[PDB]
Design a protein around this ligand. Sequence first.
Ligand code: 6U4
Ligand code: NA
Ligand code: NA
Length: 156
Amino acid sequence: MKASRLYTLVLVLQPQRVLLGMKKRGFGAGRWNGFGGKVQEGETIEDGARRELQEESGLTVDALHKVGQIVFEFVGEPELMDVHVFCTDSIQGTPVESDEMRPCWFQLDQIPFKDMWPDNSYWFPLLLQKKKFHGYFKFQGQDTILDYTLREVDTV
Ligand SMILES: Nc1[nH]c(=O)nc2c1ncn2[C@H]1C[C@H](O)[C@@H](COP(=O)(O)OP(=O)(O)OP(=O)(O)O)O1
Ligand code: NA
Ligand code: NA
């Protein structure tokens, strides 16, 4: 197969709203996304998710809940992105804007799907229903899905 690199993604989901971060600079600026990044050597995936949430947004949490796993493949990139998806509802601190990311709350009837990664339209709804999932999405560039699979699972 291909090799994969481990990433995290954290959705701060409360009963009526979700916190997302807008990419401010670089390629892909303007898109809203959960918080996360590459897992580092030595840490568990969950601890890496907590670390990235704090580094990116300022927020801390005692614990996260794992809700999904999604593999992303990009045309022209040999390495797969293996993204472990977590959900907070409980959080310490206020979110902080950085030079790279602007955080913003959205009501759950105003989820900004058109300005999110296209895959989020498929798996976000499961997350809102408190379901767990496994997914795979192959992209041409940033906007076009060529193939995907999505399945609800009982155990992630
Ligand atoms: N199709 C997609 N759908 C989605 O919802 N999140 C995606 C995505 N593609 C990438 N991401 C998320 C996964 C992860 O949280 C982040 C990508 O990680 P980054 O490259 O930002 O990692 P790092 O911040 O560790 O990188 P460095 O700045 O080089 O350290 O974007
Ligand atoms: Na990141
Ligand atoms: Na990182």
